[PDB]
Design an enzyme around this catalytic site. Structure first.
Site: not given
Ligand SMILES: *Cc1cc2c(cc1C)nc1c(=O)[nH]c(=O)nc-1n2C[C@H](O)[C@H](O)[C@H](O)COP(=O)(O)OP(=O)(O)OC[C@H]1O[C@@H](n2cnc3c(N)ncnc32)[C@H](O)[C@@H]1O
Ligand SMILES: NC(=O)c1ccccc1NC(=O)Nc1cc(Cl)cc(Cl)c1
Length: 494
Positions: A72, A134, A247
């Site tokens: 993600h 979220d 929010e």
């Molecule tokens: C896709 C998305 C992301 C998202 C979100 C909603 C959606 C639809 N809502 C968020 C929210 O409300 N608040 C927030 O703080 N972030 C939000 N995001 C972003 C998301 O949290 C970040 O992108 C985060 O990286 C989580 O993603 P994920 O589990 O899928 O990790 P990744 O994409 O594969 O890797 C991201 C980076 O981190 C390194 N990594 C991954 N796992 C680890 C561990 N265990 N230890 C250390 N580093 C790690 C990866 O290598 C990469 O650099």
């Molecule tokens: N209503 C929502 O917040 C939402 C709806 C459809 C898909 C994703 C949603 N939310 C979302 O991506 N929140 C988010 C995503 C990121 Cl990258 C960082 C922060 Cl602060 C918040």
């Protein structure tokens, strides 16, 4: 590419080098960057990750290692071209979530575990973590490598401020347990660390009693100054009797007029009433405060009076409050319903050139003027725009995660998220131009726009991002990942 010596060892039994395996690890949620690794590693235990990292770190030809959670990311941060992608989900064997409900209750969770699965396990004991992103289908290690922000962060800080301890596999291949009192330099570096100091394999997460239901509201505003004043009032110490979640959303005029006929939150009738409000003084943007009041059987009798007392203090457009009453799980997992709607319309698995900014409160009205009122006034992007403030005193500046530093006198800053979707792949350059225009406007106006979930292609951008923290980061990097093997997609130490 990989050393020949790797294939003769025990760790190689968990290595997949076939095209089907490596192609799955080649892309991310952003759908813009493609870079296949040489192999995918499927560890049985965190000890396997340690053996892979040690082998690379001591090898004659060290290869990059990238842990992949749910992918993600949208700037290729989880990609490892010329190296190995660690499928973190492979660790999900047997009990990987342990609640201690018995002093203070906590949950021990594998770095690979989804927040949705952490929630399911804690709810069985009537407990829950305090701060949520979220979207719940993200890994524990993935969100903790950034900060993990959401609607409860104004009160309890980001998810990184709600961690008791971590198990980390360093860039030297060492398995370390760290907290505020033991190995605290590694503990502080890893939280918001972007995977630069090691792979989080376990997190001990803070818990609190779980609510039963949520009174969920959306309040409409046409005036940004009134909207921001009310958000700031809602996150202040004044409002013990306020929302547990705060929010906000920015809706551009055309996204309401030419957008969907209904949404999971708003009915077709609600949207037509909002279309009238948004056209009242020619085409204008609507700002929504999204609030949530948690309750249980003990607080159920006072929640209606509590909501009325709070709303009476606010200045949203008369006749424009929107109310839902759902279970705690329905509220936390609300975005599952949004993804379901997006998937059915073929509007989910599309490119996401997302931009996230931290803006000082003192410049939020100037930011709104150049961005929503000038740059995007007539724009019609698909997706959503988030906007809500947070409290700096709930963040630990000793952690890697960056907050804006221009106003030490001011406890408040805003999170502004441009969550756009390119419904057609050829729309990506248009959204990327908007991203660049917002950053250029911040530089031109002297607005200290600190990126959240940052991405820079050169070390000069990263040095500017970390600011006064850069020397401490570089020193910690030399200590915990001297050969710069880990998460090279971050592009901080090439
Ligand atoms: C896709 C998305 C992301 C998202 C979100 C909603 C959606 C639809 N809502 C968020 C929210 O409300 N608040 C927030 O703080 N972030 C939000 N995001 C972003 C998301 O949290 C970040 O992108 C985060 O990286 C989580 O993603 P994920 O589990 O899928 O990790 P990744 O994409 O594969 O890797 C991201 C980076 O981190 C390194 N990594 C991954 N796992 C680890 C561990 N265990 N230890 C250390 N580093 C790690 C990866 O290598 C990469 O650099
Ligand atoms: N209503 C929502 O917040 C939402 C709806 C459809 C898909 C994703 C949603 N939310 C979302 O991506 N929140 C988010 C995503 C990121 Cl990258 C960082 C922060 Cl602060 C918040």
């Amino acid at each position: 590419g990989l050393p020949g010596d790797l294939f003769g060892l025990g760790i190689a039994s968990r290595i997949r080098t076939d095209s089907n395996s490596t192609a799955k690890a080649a892309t991310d949620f952003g759908q813009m960057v493609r870079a296949a690794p040489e192999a995918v590693f499927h560890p049985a235990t965190p000890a396997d990750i340690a053996a892979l990292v040690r082998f690379s770190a001591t090898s004659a030809a060290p290869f990059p290692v990238a842990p992949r959670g749910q992918g993600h990311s949208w700037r290729g941060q989880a990609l490892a071209p010329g190296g190995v992608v660690v499928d973190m989900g492979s660790l999900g064997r047997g009990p990987r979530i342990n609640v201690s409900a018995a002093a203070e209750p906590f949950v021990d969770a594998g770095g690979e575990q989804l927040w949705v699965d952490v929630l399911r396990a804690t709810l069985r004991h009537g407990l829950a973590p305090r701060v949520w992103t979220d979207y719940l289908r993200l890994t524990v290690g993935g969100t903790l490598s950034n900060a993990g922000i959401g609607g409860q962060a104004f009160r309890h800080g980001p998810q990184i401020a709600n961690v008791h301890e971590l198990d980390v596999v360093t860039g030297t291949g060492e398995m370390v347990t760290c907290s505020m009192d033991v190995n605290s330099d590694l503990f502080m570096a890893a939280l918001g660390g972007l995977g630069q100091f090691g792979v989080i394999t376990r997190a001990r997460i803070r818990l609190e009693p779980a609510p039963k239901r949520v009174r969920w509201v959306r309040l409409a505003y046409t005036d940004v100054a009134t909207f921001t004043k009310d958000q700031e009032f809602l996150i202040s110490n004044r409002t013990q009797v306020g929302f547990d979640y705060v929010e906000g959303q920015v809706q551009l005029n055309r996204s309401l007029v030419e957008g969907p006929k209904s949404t999971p939150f708003f009915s077709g009738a609600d949207l037509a009433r909002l279309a009238g409000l948004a056209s009242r003084t020619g085409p204008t943007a609507i700002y929504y405060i999204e609030g949530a009041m948690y309750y249980t059987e003990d607080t159920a009798i006072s929640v209606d009076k509590k909501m009325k007392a709070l709303l009476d203090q606010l200045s949203f457009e008369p006749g424009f409050p929107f109310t839902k009453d759902v279970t705690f799980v329905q509220f936390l997992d609300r975005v599952r319903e949004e993804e379901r709607v997006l998937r059915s319309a073929g509007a989910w698995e599309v490119p996401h050139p997302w931009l996230n900014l931290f803006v000082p409160r003192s410049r939020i009205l100037d930011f709104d003027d150049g961005v929503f009122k000038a740059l995007l006034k007539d724009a019609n992007p698909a997706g959503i725009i988030l906007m809500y403030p947070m409290n700096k005193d709930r963040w630990d500046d000793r952690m890697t995660a960056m907050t804006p530093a221009t106003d030490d006198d001011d406890n408040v800053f805003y999170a502004v998220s441009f969550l756009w979707s390119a419904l057609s792949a050829d729309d990506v350059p248009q959204l990327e131009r908007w991203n660049k225009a917002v950053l250029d406007f911040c530089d031109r106006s002297g607005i200290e726009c600190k990126q959240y979930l940052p991405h820079y292609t050169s070390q000069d951008g990263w040095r500017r991002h970390f600011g006064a923290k850069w020397s401490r980061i570089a020193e910690l990097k030399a200590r915990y990942d001297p050969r710069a093997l880990l998460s090279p997609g971050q592009r901080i130490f090439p």
